[PDB]
């Protein structure tokens, strides 16, 4: 089979957004759970994002990318795995609209790289070090 | 029943339609051109190489093609020469555009280029114009003929066509006045009889119509008799005779007295009405109904030929030159209400016993109707079309003394000029100006393909001599002579005509390339 | 109907070209290939695309032969030889629709190529075999697309000097099979070991008894697995290797068991014979070649004339690397064997890194094969188009019209490079031509600059062989496809 | 039903927008529409596109309603009302899917149209006599609007046919009907002629005319709804007979009756006799003997204006004519424009109307400059009617979009998303102005945003050179009430589309 152009780009979006429907609800301490079922009949229900993705059966080849990138986030850092899928699916959905507006895929990729290059600088501004604990303990409210 | 297609892909549908129009008319270009079979709505078989009739009888359902035809009508109406080239060139202009569309050239960027490229081409053609009327007036008549034969030698008459050119050049000489500086082509009527030969066509200095005198005892020629108001023609609906209905009578006859009494009425109305012919001022009488025999014999003493069952438009054509009128009754007729001519004579043509009527002024007439014969009914139809076209050939040669040496040489000459301006572009428009030349090449290419010459090497043969040598005419050999040089073969086209061909074709690009939607609604 | 046969041959080949058209450039689009073995691969490597395409169309299998030929000829830009083929076929379709017989078409493309190679020779930026400045310059810029190109500056003299040693200054041929790159875990990216001889991937005897080194070492290759179905039999086999005084033994990796039973291994230790195991088939072709020896398949056919000679045989074990180097072969029939050990961090990194250096070795070979550097960014394709268009103006006949269509086809490379860069296609090529009206090599499609500039100033040059073979091999494909008159089955 | 009925209704509105998308602008594209009468039109006029649009979807019929009213209520804007209204629907697709209720969407659009029109009012510049007059202002605007056309070389002739043609109209009662447009085939654009009066065909299939006085310094016009003829040049009519001796007597009697009507007209004294029905040969020579003009084939569009021109009227009766039915102009003459007979009145001092007679190479070639004069007439019409000027060529949509962004910076809540979309939708006008013109839409729109954000409120789209420039200085002037009523029109249109949750269909 030969699938290329607008077709493969639209199919990739349907896959990524479909994967997001599996992670959408898992974000937050007030989250909603999802349950996975195998053939022998074992079932498990979890709010853990790494488990939600680790046990997820993904057949579409574009989703196999989303999983490979998500698993590396867990192996390397161990947290932030929920944000990977949610952020990615909004990036692609809005990217699909950019493509339909006659913006070449290379132009989209180049600019997305530029925004990240700047973002690390804004993170440096807004972030704070391990402070706000001496003289006043805001970790009291964490506790 | 509407269309749905989004994007520039719709323009690919539009151009691919035009390629169908061209595939019809293409093979008709050239004196070696191939004919089309025209199936008339009634089953009549018409065979013609004239693109005007090919396009007129061409029926296509894609509205894009209906535009191409309706716009080409302006080439036939205003100029009357190369309607074929308007469609052929436009197709090539759209074909090169299809390449430009795929290259990503915006539709308007295409149109703006064809407009400016035409400004270059028409200007470079003017640099090469020639004056066909130069030097003496006798030379004008000579070259006028030499070119008229080029339009007539391409038809079935080509054997002795010089005779159709004889009437053509002499007709426009009679119909053209250099003080007027214009030719009213409506002053010439085209008319002939079915059957005959080329040599049986005649140059008639006056009006001839498909009629003959209705009574053999009446004189076949009427003259003013030295000083009268010429020969007047009665144009009425009713005959000069005792009134007799042509539908129903219903005259009750009570006795023998009443029976024959009508004959007494007829005798006075016989002499009265035939006297009312002379008193009304008619030298011949033509009415929509025929005339009583006894009236006819009383007309004889006054030399009053007459014709029966004649329509108004045919007598109008006479009345145009004679200033006649359709007066409701014979009593209000006068020397002027009845139009005047000098001579009406009835001419027999060898074995043709039709014996048609000719109306002349015994001088330079305000109208001529030339006489056409030909060995087949359908040959006559096309032969008169040749006189129609050759009439417009000389009509344009009168309008504009500027001529071009054609046969595709002017198109190749203009093509080379476009390629000269290609290097001066060095921009986005360089993509488009070059394609204008690739389209201009399709005219000499089509001329060669319909002639049996190499479709590619012919282009290089013409370009070789028109580039490395001189702007001297290097044409296509479709006529079968030795070589190029239409100046030697005296194959010449009007300058203003070729200008209109280029400009009108550019307009077609503005029309086709700027239509983005075809919405075909239904009918209730 | 041969017109129907040709129509199918052209349509099929165009569909292969339209598949690779998106892959050209460092910004290229990736292709997904779902293989019949069940593996879905994603890559921008062009030969990988056509290799895993698994083309079943008999006519399109010629396009694979084009790719492999371009790889064995120059070894770089093998994406472009397919794209060039595609444009010449698409232009050929226009020529076929104009009614020009394929024979006239093919011979006209032949004459275009003859002039095209000459055009490239004109714009050649001169190089020299001693010019290590430009050799290191261009080679590291060919490594610029790699994962860590900052450490490739030190990988540059590895490729440049190692080839300049194996290749004579006045020489027309360099063998890349005689330069073997071997990976090794440990070290840094700039750390590689270039050896002027064969390098053995295994060490002396695995069990105790390994001599680890030999002086006046004679190298034999006995490949057959030695194990019991025994004492005298297994021992006498290796005894004769001592009889002729062979001091180093290479043993092919066996599918049965380990090289040799410990009885004959410890006996080879007692014979003072250094035992090398698990040698690969291709290793024998590499190793026995440079050493000047003939391999023996069995254990019975040992002879004396096949003895080797090695000045240095020692185990190079650096931080637990465990690889042997053998230098000073001095064999009359041998060639200057060069082998490199690639140090690095992760096994997966050094595996791909080795392949990145194979790309570089092809670059230097291209410069030895034919001297010259050529502008990148498709600049030579725009320049050739202008010259052949200029020459087609004075050329006469149908041969001129085909030459003109050739020039139109030459735009597929600068057009593809611009499209995959995301620049307005007509804007770029328009500017390319305007710039070529003034400059020659001063032009090129720049990804970093998003415009037209001098790839020489951007340090992007390509061997003139790459461009010369790209046009040359393409004309051979165009002839091959246009000459296909019918397809029949044989049985 | 439900929110999905809105989704379907929005999809219907998209069809209308995409259809009229290419029609925007002087560089725009035409649409070929085949009517049920087999007459096909190719036009860029949104009103012509609307009259024949043939919408069957009940939801899109609403868009036709607001647009057809935009034509008569204001006089211009039939395209922009459909583009702006459609994009306000396209921007609503993501907001509906996210669950924002239709009141929340419509409420913000109603707040936005109030916040936006206020700024359109602030931008208006009062230009009536403002440092200009007829010869300066109307030429600066007409010469601009008529640029980039087939008359690019011949503008002075169409500026004469434009500015002095409209400036010479009755300004106290100013309307488009005061200038007629007639296509005269043949001639050249630099030679096209305009007339103070109205023209007629006078192309009868009968020859023998012109030997009749066609010109009077003080004509007396009598208009009839009946023909003046007996013997027809082509067809005929049944004449009833009573006796074989009266077969030809009724023909004489038919002369008497028509001679009698022509005799009473002979005495009536009209030097011009106009008719809506054909004129025959008996009247042809009869009125030639009377040496007065008589012609049929006169329309009410030509004739009712003759009534204004000369001061006559229509009276078919021959004896009952009241003197008020006859009138006189300063000059009448049948004109031979372009070597074709077109009768007209010349220099009528009571005429409040005039006609542009268009000469050119071909009928379509004329049509290209024909609708160009059609627009040029409206260019001056609004220059006089509307003193309040807002910058055209997309400059207004730039100015408004900035103020909308500032309202979304200050206004917080669910209104923020709706205000932002109302602004994003105003970029569809400059976007289609660029895509229909052939420019790089991304480049121009980004330069429009940056340039306007520098404080220049007059920047806009320049069609001559692909660039952003001061369209106010370019005299690209558009009426304020057109932009105000158009913006209010679109908001109400979106209130109609977004507010439908069910379609009820009675089939039978």
State the CATH number of the domain containing residue C249.
3.50.7.10
DSSP string, B232-265: EEEEESS-SSS---SS-------SHHHHHHHHHH
Any CB–CB contact under 8 A between D442 and chain A? Answer: yes
Q: Are residues B235 and B306 in the same domain?
A: yes
The Cβ of residue B463 has, within 10 Å, a number of other Cβ atoms equal to 21
* Contact indicator for C203, C315 with CB cutoff of 8 Å: yes
CA C467, CA B231: separation in Å to the nearest integer? 93
- For residue D404, what are the CA distances in angstroms to D112, D429, D443, D498? 8, 16, 22, 21
Q: Are residues C340 and C357 in the same domain?
A: yes
The subunits that touch chain B, with at least 3 C-beta pairs less than 8 Å apart, are C, D
- Name residues whose C-beta falls within 8 Å of residue D493's C-beta, 6 or more positions apart in sequence: D62, D63, D66, D81, D85, D88
CA C225, CA D27: separation in Å to the nearest integer? 85
- For residue C313, what are the CA distances in angstroms to B140, C291, C296, C308, C342? 107, 12, 21, 12, 20
- Name residues whose C-beta falls within 8 Å of residue D264's C-beta, 6 or more positions apart in sequence: D318, D319
Residue of C393, C424, C430 lying closest to B427 (CB–CB): C430
Phi, psi of B307 (to 5 degrees): -135, 145
DSSP category for residue B77: I
Q: Are residues B505 and B360 in the same domain?
A: no
Among chain D residues, the shortest Cα distance to B115 is held by D150
The Cβ of residue C79 has, within 10 Å, a number of other Cβ atoms equal to 24
* Contact indicator for D383, D376 with CB cutoff of 8 Å: no
* Contact indicator for D2, D501 with CB cutoff of 8 Å: yes
CA D277, CA D228: separation in Å to the nearest integer? 8
* Contact indicator for B254, B377 with CB cutoff of 8 Å: no
Q: Are residues C152 and C259 in the same domain?
A: no
Final residue in a domain of this structure, among B341, B365, B389? B365
Q: Which two tokens stand for residue B33?
A: 């051109």
Catalytic residue numbers of B read 50, 83-84, 389
Q: Are residues D187 and D206 in the same domain?
A: no
Any CB–CB contact under 8 A between B418 and chain C? Answer: no
Q: Which two tokens stand for residue B510?
A: 């503005």
* Contact indicator for D296, D276 with CB cutoff of 8 Å: yes
Final residue in a domain of this structure, among C314, C335, C356? C335
Pick from C73, C114, C83, C81: nearest CA to C474: C81
Q: Are residues D328 and D206 in the same domain?
A: yes
Collapsing DSSP to helix, strand or coil, B395 comes out as helix
Burial class (CB in 10 A: 0-12, 13-18, 19+), A99: middle
Q: Are residues C285 and C186 in the same domain?
A: no
Collapsing DSSP to helix, strand or coil, D459 comes out as strand
CA A102, CA A100: separation in Å to the nearest integer? 6
The subunits that touch chain C, with at least 3 C-beta pairs less than 8 Å apart, are A, B
Q: Are residues D167 and D210 in the same domain?
A: no
Phi, psi of C11 (to 5 degrees): -60, -45
Distance, CA of B461 to chain centre: 35
Nearest 10 degrees: Cα torsion D458, D462, D467, D472: -20
Q: Are residues B149 and B260 in the same domain?
A: no
Domain containing D345: what range?
Answer: 199-384
Q: Which two tokens stand for residue D471?
A: 């369209």
CA B421, CA B410: separation in Å to the nearest integer? 17
CA D168, CA D185: separation in Å to the nearest integer? 26
Phi, psi of A60 (to 5 degrees): -60, 135
Strands B188-192 and B368-372: parallel
CA B436, CA B118: separation in Å to the nearest integer? 8
- Name residues whose C-beta falls within 8 Å of residue C175's C-beta, 6 or more positions apart in sequence: C166, C335
Pick from D332, D46, D364, D23: nearest CA to D196: D332
Strand partners, A37: A43
DSSP string, B142-175: HHHHHHHHHHHTTSGGGGTTHHHHHHHHHHHHHH
Residue D446 to chain A, least CA–CA distance (Å): 14
Phi, psi of D481 (to 5 degrees): -70, -25
CA B69, CA B54: separation in Å to the nearest integer? 10
Collapsing DSSP to helix, strand or coil, C292 comes out as coil
Sign of the alpha-carbon dihedral angle for C415, C416, C418, C423:
positive
CA D144, CA D141: separation in Å to the nearest integer? 5
Which element (helix H / strand E) includes D215? strand D215-216
> CATH code at D178?
3.30.260.10
Residue B521 to chain C, least CA–CA distance (Å): 37
Q: Which two tokens stand for residue C358?
A: 């194979």
- Contact list, D443 vs chain A (CB under 8 Å): none
> CATH code at D324?
3.50.7.10
C168 is known as an active-site residue: no
Phi, psi of D279 (to 5 degrees): -110, 135
CA B304, CA B232: separation in Å to the nearest integer? 10
User: Torsion-angle region of residue B487: left (phi > 0), alpha (psi -120 to 50) or beta?
Assistant: alpha
CA C67, CA C53: separation in Å to the nearest integer? 12
* Contact indicator for C474, C84 with CB cutoff of 8 Å: yes
Q: Are residues C80 and C95 in the same domain?
A: yes
The subunits that touch chain A, with at least 3 C-beta pairs less than 8 Å apart, are C, D
Strands A34-37 and A43-46: antiparallel
CA B415, CA A135: separation in Å to the nearest integer? 89
Contact C420 A109 (CB under 8 A): no
Pick from B169, B185, B204: nearest CA to B361: B204
Residue of D18, D36, D207 lying closest to B523 (CB–CB): D36
CA C335, CA C177: separation in Å to the nearest integer? 11
Any CB–CB contact under 8 A between C330 and chain A? Answer: no
Q: Are residues D227 and D186 in the same domain?
A: no
CA C167, CA D476: separation in Å to the nearest integer? 73
Q: Are residues C68 and C98 in the same domain?
A: yes
> CATH code at B167?
3.30.260.10
The Cβ of residue C195 has, within 10 Å, a number of other Cβ atoms equal to 20
Q: Which two tokens stand for residue A3?
A: 């699938």
State the count of interchain CB pairs (< 8 A) between B and C. 36
CA D369, CA D153: separation in Å to the nearest integer? 13
Distance, CA of C480 to chain centre: 24
Q: Are residues B143 and B261 in the same domain?
A: no
Collapsing DSSP to helix, strand or coil, C370 comes out as coil
Q: Do chains B and C touch (3 or more CB pairs under 8 A)?
A: yes
CA B73, CA C327: separation in Å to the nearest integer? 91
Alpha helices (H) along B400-441: 409-420, 430-440
Contacts 24+ apart (CB under 8 A), B13-19: B14/B64, B14/B512, B14/B515, B14/B518, B15/B94, B15/B95, B15/B97, B15/B98, B15/B101, B15/B512, B16/B98, B17/B62, B17/B64, B17/B65, B18/B64, B18/B65, B18/B68, B18/B90, B18/B91, B18/B94, B18/B512, B19/B91, B19/B94, B19/B95
Final residue in a domain of this structure, among C312, C345, C371? C371
- For residue D367, what are the CA distances in angstroms to B71, B453, D192? 12, 41, 13
Phi, psi of B191 (to 5 degrees): -155, 145
Q: Are residues B200 and B211 in the same domain?
A: no
Strand partners, D335: D342
Strands B515-520 and D30-34: parallel
Sheet holding B343-349, edge to edge: B207-209, B352-360, B343-349, B221-222
Pick from D308, D316, D248, D241: nearest CA to D276: D316
CA D176, CA A21: separation in Å to the nearest integer? 60
Q: Are residues D148 and D249 in the same domain?
A: no
Burial D287-318 (b: 16+ CB within 10 A, else e): bbebebbbbbbbeeebbbbbbbbbbbbbbbeb
DSSP string, D325-359: G----S-EEEE-GGGS-EEEE---TT---EEEEEE
Q: Are residues D167 and D311 in the same domain?
A: no
- For residue D269, what are the CA distances in angstroms to B85, D262, D264, D265, D286? 55, 11, 9, 7, 13
* Contact indicator for B403, B130 with CB cutoff of 8 Å: yes
DSSP category for residue C254: P
CA D188, CA D184: separation in Å to the nearest integer? 10
CA B282, CA C369: separation in Å to the nearest integer? 109
- Name residues whose C-beta falls within 8 Å of residue A41's C-beta, 6 or more positions apart in sequence: none
Contact C422 A4 (CB under 8 A): no
Domain containing B200: what range?
Answer: 133-205+366-401
Question: Token pair 């649409």 is at which residue?
Answer: D31
CA B356, CA D276: separation in Å to the nearest integer? 40
Any CB–CB contact under 8 A between D206 and chain B? Answer: yes
* Contact indicator for D254, D229 with CB cutoff of 8 Å: no
C79 is known as an active-site residue: yes
CA B476, CA B498: separation in Å to the nearest integer? 17
CA C268, CA C252: separation in Å to the nearest integer? 16
Question: Token pair 């290749």 is at which residue?
Answer: C167
Pick from B475, B496, B379: nearest CA to B81: B496
- Name residues whose C-beta falls within 8 Å of residue D118's C-beta, 6 or more positions apart in sequence: none
Q: Are residues C94 and C120 in the same domain?
A: yes
Helices then strands, each counted (H, E), chain C = 16, 15
Resolution in A: 4.1
CA B199, CA B201: separation in Å to the nearest integer? 5
Domain containing C319: what range?
Answer: 197-335
* Contact indicator for B517, D19 with CB cutoff of 8 Å: yes
Q: Which two tokens stand for residue B164?
A: 């159709």
Q: Are residues C112 and C148 in the same domain?
A: no
Q: Are residues D163 and D218 in the same domain?
A: no
CA C425, CA C42: separation in Å to the nearest integer? 26
- Contact list, B102 vs chain C (CB under 8 Å): none
The CA angle C261-C264-C266, to the nearest 5 degrees, is 100
Domain count, chain B: 3
The CA angle B413-B417-B418, to the nearest 5 degrees, is 120
Any CB–CB contact under 8 A between B427 and chain C? Answer: yes
Q: Are residues C147 and C255 in the same domain?
A: no
The Cβ of residue D349 has, within 10 Å, a number of other Cβ atoms equal to 11
* Contact indicator for D341, D333 with CB cutoff of 8 Å: no
Q: What is the Cα gyration radius of chain A?
A: 19
Q: Are residues B309 and B390 in the same domain?
A: no
Q: Are residues C167 and C206 in the same domain?
A: no
- Contact list, C34 vs chain A (CB under 8 Å): 61
Final residue in a domain of this structure, among C314, C348, C371? C371
- Contact list, A104 vs chain C (CB under 8 Å): 419, 422
Pick from D248, D230, D333, D330: nearest CA to D286: D230
* Contact indicator for B370, B167 with CB cutoff of 8 Å: yes
Distance, CA of D14 to chain centre: 26
Domain count, chain C: 3
Q: Are residues B143 and B251 in the same domain?
A: no
Sign of the alpha-carbon dihedral angle for D40, D46, D50, D51:
negative
Q: Which two tokens stand for residue B261?
A: 């009494």
Strand partners, B494: B403
Q: Are residues D190 and D233 in the same domain?
A: no
DSSP string, D379-421: HHHHHHH--EEEETTTHHHHHHHHHHHHHHHH--SHHHHHHHH
Contact A105 C422 (CB under 8 A): yes
Technique behind the model: cryo-EM
Contact C397 B455 (CB under 8 A): no
CA C138, CA C140: separation in Å to the nearest integer? 6
CA B371, CA A36: separation in Å to the nearest integer? 99
The CA angle B229-B234-B236, to the nearest 5 degrees, is 155
Q: Are residues C348 and C437 in the same domain?
A: no
Which element (helix H / strand E) includes C249? strand C248-252
Breaks (C-N over 2.5 A) in chain D follow: none
* Contact indicator for C216, C247 with CB cutoff of 8 Å: yes
- Contact list, A4 vs chain C (CB under 8 Å): 19, 22
Which element (helix H / strand E) includes B190? strand B188-192
End-to-end CA distance of chain D: 21
* Contact indicator for B394, B169 with CB cutoff of 8 Å: yes
Residue of A2, A61, A110 lying closest to C40 (CB–CB): A61
Collapsing DSSP to helix, strand or coil, C195 comes out as strand
Q: Are residues B197 and B212 in the same domain?
A: no
Collapsing DSSP to helix, strand or coil, A71 comes out as helix
Burial D431-455 (b: 16+ CB within 10 A, else e): bbbbbbbbbbbeebbeebbebbeee
């Amino acid at each position: 089979e030969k699938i290329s152009g607008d077709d493969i780009r639209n199919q990739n979006v349907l896959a990524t957004m479909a994967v997001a429907n599996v992670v959408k609800s898992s974000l937050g301490p007030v989250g909603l759970d999802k349950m996975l079922v195998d053939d022998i009949g074992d079932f498990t229900v979890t709010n853990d994002g790494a488990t939600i993705l680790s046990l997820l059966d993904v057949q579409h080849p574009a989703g196999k990318i989303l999983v490979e990138l998500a698993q590396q986030q867990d192996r390397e850092i161990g947290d932030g795995t929920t944000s990977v899928v949610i952020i990615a699916s909004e990036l692609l959905k809005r990217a699909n609209e950019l493509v339909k507006n006659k913006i070449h895929p290379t132009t989209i990729i180049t600019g997305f790289r530029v925004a990240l290059r700047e973002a690390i600088r804004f993170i440096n501004e807004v972030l704070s070090t391990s402070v706000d604990t001496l003289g006043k303990e805001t970790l009291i409210n964490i506790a | 029943n509407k269309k749905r297609q989004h994007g520039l892909e719709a323009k690919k549908s539009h151009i691919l339609a035009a390629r169908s129009v061209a595939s019809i008319i293409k093979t008709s270009l050239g004196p070696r051109g191939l004919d089309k079979i025209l199936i008339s709505p009634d089953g009549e078989i018409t065979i013609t190489n004239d693109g005007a009739t090919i396009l007129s009888q061409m029926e296509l359902d894609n509205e894009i093609a209906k535009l191409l035809v309706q716009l080409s009508k302006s080439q036939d109406d205003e100029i009357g020469d190369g309607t074929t080239g308007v469609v052929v060139l436009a197709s090539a202009l759209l074909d090169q555009a299809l390449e430009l569309i795929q290259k990503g050239i915006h539709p308007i960027k295409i149109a703006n280029g064809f407009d400016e490229a035409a400004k270059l081409a028409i200007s470079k053609l003017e640099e090469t114009c020639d004056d066909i009327s130069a030097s003496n007036d006798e030379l004008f008549r000579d070259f006028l003929l030499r070119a008229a034969k080029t339009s007539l030698g391409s038809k079935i008459v080509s054997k002795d066509h010089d005779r159709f050119a004889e009437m053509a050049v002499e007709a426009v000489i009679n119909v053209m006045d250099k003080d007027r500086k214009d030719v009213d082509f409506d002053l010439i009527k085209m008319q002939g009889r079915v059957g005959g030969s080329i040599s049986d066509s005649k140059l008639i200095n006056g009006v001839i119509l498909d009629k003959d005198f209705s009574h053999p005892q009446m004189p076949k020629c009427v003259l003013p008799k030295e000083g009268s108001d010429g020969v007047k023609l009665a144009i009425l609906t009713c005959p000069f005779e005792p009134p007799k209905p042509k539908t129903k009578h219903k005259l009750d006859i009570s006795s023998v007295e009443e029976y024959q009494k009508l004959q007494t009425y007829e005798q006075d109305k016989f002499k009265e009405m035939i006297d009312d012919v002379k008193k009304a001022g008619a030298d011949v009488v033509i009415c929509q109904w025929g005339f009583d025999d006894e009236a006819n014999h009383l007309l004889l003493q006054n030399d009053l030929p007459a014709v029966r069952w004649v329509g108004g438009q045919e007598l109008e054509h006479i009345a145009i030159s004679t200033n006649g009128r359709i007066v409701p009754r014979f009593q209000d007729l006068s020397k002027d209400k009845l139009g005047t001519c000098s001579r009406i004579y009835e001419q027999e043509f060898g074995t043709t016993k039709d014996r048609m009527l000719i109306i002349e002024q015994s001088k330079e007439t305000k109208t001529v109707t030339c006489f056409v014969r030909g060995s087949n009914k359908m040959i006559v139809d096309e032969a008169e079309r040749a006189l129609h076209d050759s009439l417009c050939v000389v009509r344009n040669l009168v309008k504009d003394s500027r001529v071009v040496y054609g046969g595709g040489a002017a198109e190749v000459t203009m093509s080379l000029a476009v390629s000269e301006e290609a290097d001066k572009q060095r921009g986005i428009d360089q993509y488009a100006f070059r394609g204008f030349a690739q389209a201009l090449d399709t005219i000499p290419m089509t001329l060669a393909e319909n002639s049996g010459l190499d479709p590619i090497g012919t282009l290089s043969t013409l370009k070789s001599k028109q580039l490395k040598e001189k702007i001297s005419n290097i044409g296509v050999d479709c006529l079968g002579y030795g070589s190029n040089d239409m100046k030697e073969l005296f194959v010449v086209d009007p300058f203003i005509g070729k200008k209109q061909q280029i400009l009108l074709a550019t307009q077609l690009c503005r029309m086709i390339l700027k239509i983005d939607n075809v919405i075909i609604s239904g009918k209730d | 109907k041969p017109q129907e046969v040709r129509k199918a041959n052209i349509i099929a080949a165009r569909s292969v070209a339209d598949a690779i058209r998106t892959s050209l450039g460092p910004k290229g689009m990736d292709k997904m290939i779902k293989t019949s073995r069940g593996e879905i691969i994603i890559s921008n490597d062009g030969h990988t695309i056509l290799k895993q395409m698994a083309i079943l169309h008999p006519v399109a299998r010629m396009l694979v032969e084009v790719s492999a030929a371009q790889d064995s000829e120059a070894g770089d830009g093998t994406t472009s030889v397919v794209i060039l083929t595609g444009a010449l076929l698409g232009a050929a379709e226009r020529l076929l629709n104009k009614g020009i017989h394929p024979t006239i078409i093919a011979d006209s493309f032949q004459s275009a190529a003859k002039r095209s190679v000459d055009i490239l020779l004109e714009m050649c930026h001169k190089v020299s075999l001693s010019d290590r400045e430009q050799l290191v310059r261009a080679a590291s810029t060919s490594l610029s697309s790699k994962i860590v190109s900052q450490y490739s500056s030190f990988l540059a003299p590895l490729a440049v000097d190692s080839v300049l040693k194996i290749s004579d200054e006045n020489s027309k041929n360099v063998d890349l099979n005689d330069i073997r790159l071997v990976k090794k875990v440990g070290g840094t990216i700039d750390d590689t070991e270039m050896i002027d001889g064969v390098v053995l991937t295994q060490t002396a005897i695995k069990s105790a008894g390994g001599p680890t080194r030999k002086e006046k070492a004679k190298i034999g290759l006995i490949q057959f697995q030695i194990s019991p179905p025994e004492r005298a039999y297994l021992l006498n086999i290796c005894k004769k290797i001592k009889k002729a005084k062979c001091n180093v033994l290479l043993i092919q990796k066996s599918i049965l068991r380990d090289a040799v039973n410990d009885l004959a291994l410890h006996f080879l230790s007692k014979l003072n014979i250094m035992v090398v195991k698990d040698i690969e088939r291709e290793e024998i072709e590499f190793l026995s070649k440079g050493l000047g020896c003939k391999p023996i398949a069995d254990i019975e056919l040992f002879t004396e004339d096949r003895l080797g000679s090695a000045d240095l045989v020692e185990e190079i074990d650096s931080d637990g690397s465990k690889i042997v180097r053998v230098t000073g072969i001095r064999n009359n029939n041998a060639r200057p064997t060069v082998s490199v050990v690639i140090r690095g961090a992760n096994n997966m990194i050094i595996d791909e890194t080795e392949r990145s250096l194979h790309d570089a070795l092809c670059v230097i070979r291209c410069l030895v094969k034919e001297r010259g550097l050529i502008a990148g960014g498709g600049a030579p394709e725009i320049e050739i188009s202008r010259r052949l268009s200029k020459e087609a103006r004075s050329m006469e006949g149908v041969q001129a019209f085909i030459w003109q269509e050739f020039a139109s086809a030459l735009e597929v490379i600068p057009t593809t490079l611009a499209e995959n860069a995301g620049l307005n296609s007509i804007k770029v090529v328009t500017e390319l031509r305007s710039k070529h009206e003034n400059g020659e090599l001063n032009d090129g499609i720049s990804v970093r600059r998003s415009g037209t500039t001098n790839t020489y100033e951007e340090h992007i040059l390509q061997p003139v062989l790459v461009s010369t073979s790209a046009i040359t091999l393409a004309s051979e494909c165009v002839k091959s496809i246009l000459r296909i008159d019918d397809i029949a089955f044989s049985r | 039903q439900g929110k999905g009925q809105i989704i379907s209704n929005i999809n219907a509105c998209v069809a209308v927008q995409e259809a009229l998308k290419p029609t925007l602008g002087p560089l725009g594209s035409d649409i070929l529409i085949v009517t049920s009468n087999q007459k096909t039109t190719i036009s860029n006029d949104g009103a012509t596109i609307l009259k024949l649009l043939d919408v069957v979807h009940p939801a899109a019929k609403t868009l036709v309603d607001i647009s057809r009213a935009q034509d008569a209520e204001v006089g211009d804007g039939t395209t922009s009302v459909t583009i702006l209204a459609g994009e306000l629907m396209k921007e609503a697709k993501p907001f509906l899917e996210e669950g924002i209720s239709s009141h929340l969407i419509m409420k913000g659009y109603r707040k936005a149209v109030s916040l936006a029109v206020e700024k359109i009012n602030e931008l208006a510049v009062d230009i009536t006599s403002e440092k200009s007059s007829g010869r300066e202002l109307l030429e600066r605007c007409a010469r601009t609007a008529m640029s980039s056309k087939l008359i690019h070389n011949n503008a002075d002739f169409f500026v004469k046919m434009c500015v002095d043609a409209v400036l010479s109209l009755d300004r106290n009662d100013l309307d488009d009907k005061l200038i007629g447009i007639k296509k005269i085939p043949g001639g050249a654009m630099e030679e096209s002629l305009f007339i103070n009066g109205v023209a007629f065909k006078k192309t009868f299939s009968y020859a023998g005319f012109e030997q009749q006085p066609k010109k009077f310094n003080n004509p007396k016009i009598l208009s009839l709804n009946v023909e003046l003829e007996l013997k027809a040049e082509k067809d005929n009519a049944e004449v009833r007979v009573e006796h074989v001796e009266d077969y030809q007597a009724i023909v004489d009697a038919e002369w008497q009756l028509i001679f009698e009507k022509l005799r009473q007209v002979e005495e009536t004294g009209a030097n011009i006799v106009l008719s809506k029905l054909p004129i025959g040969d008996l009247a042809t020579q009869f009125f030639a003997d009377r040496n007065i003009f008589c012609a049929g084939r006169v329309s009410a569009d030509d004739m009712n204006r003759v009534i204004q021109a000369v001061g006559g009227s229509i009276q078919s009766t021959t004896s009952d004519i009241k003197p008020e039915h006859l009138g006189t102009c300063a000059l009448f003459e049948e004109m031979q424009i372009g070597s074709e007979r077109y009768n007209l009145f010349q220099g009528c001092p009571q005429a409040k109307t005039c006609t542009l007679l268009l000469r050119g190479g071909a009928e379509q070639v004329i049509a290209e400059v024909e609708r160009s004069l059609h627009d040029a007439i409206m260019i001056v019409k609004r220059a006089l009617q509307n003193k309040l000027i807002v910058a055209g060529g997309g400059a207004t949509e730039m100015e408004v979009s900035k103020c909308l962004r500032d309202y979304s910076k200050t206004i917080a809540g669910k209104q923020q998303m709706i205000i932002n979309a109302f602004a994003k939708a105003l970029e569809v006008i400059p976007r289609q102005l660029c895509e229909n013109a052939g420019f790089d839409a991304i480049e121009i729109l980004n330069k429009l945003r940056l340039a306007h954000s520098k404080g220049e409120k007059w920047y806009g789209v320049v069609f001559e050179t692909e660039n952003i420039g001061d369209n106010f200085a370019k005299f690209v002037w558009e009426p304020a009430l057109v932009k105000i009523n158009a913006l209010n029109s679109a908001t109400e249109a979106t209130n109609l589309i977004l507010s439908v949750d069910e379609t009820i269909t009675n089939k039978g």
